[PDB]
Amino acid sequence: AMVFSSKSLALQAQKKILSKIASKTVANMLIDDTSSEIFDELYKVTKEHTHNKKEAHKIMKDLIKVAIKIGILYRNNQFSQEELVIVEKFRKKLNQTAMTIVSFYEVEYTFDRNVLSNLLHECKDLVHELVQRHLTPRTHGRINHVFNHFADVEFLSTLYSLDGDCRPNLKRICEGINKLLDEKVL
Amino acid sequence: FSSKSLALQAQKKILSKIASKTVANMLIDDTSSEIFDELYKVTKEHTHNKKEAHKIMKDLIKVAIKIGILYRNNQFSQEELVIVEKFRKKLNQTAMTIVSFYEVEYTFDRNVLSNLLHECKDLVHELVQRHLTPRTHGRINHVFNHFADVEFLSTLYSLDGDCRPNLKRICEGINKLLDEKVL
Ligand SMILES: [Cl-]
Ligand SMILES: [Cl-]
Ligand SMILES: [Cl-]
Ligand SMILES: [Cl-]
Ligand SMILES: [Cl-]
Question: Among partner residues B11, B54, B62, which is closest to A4 by beta-carbon distance?
Answer without folding.
Answer: B54
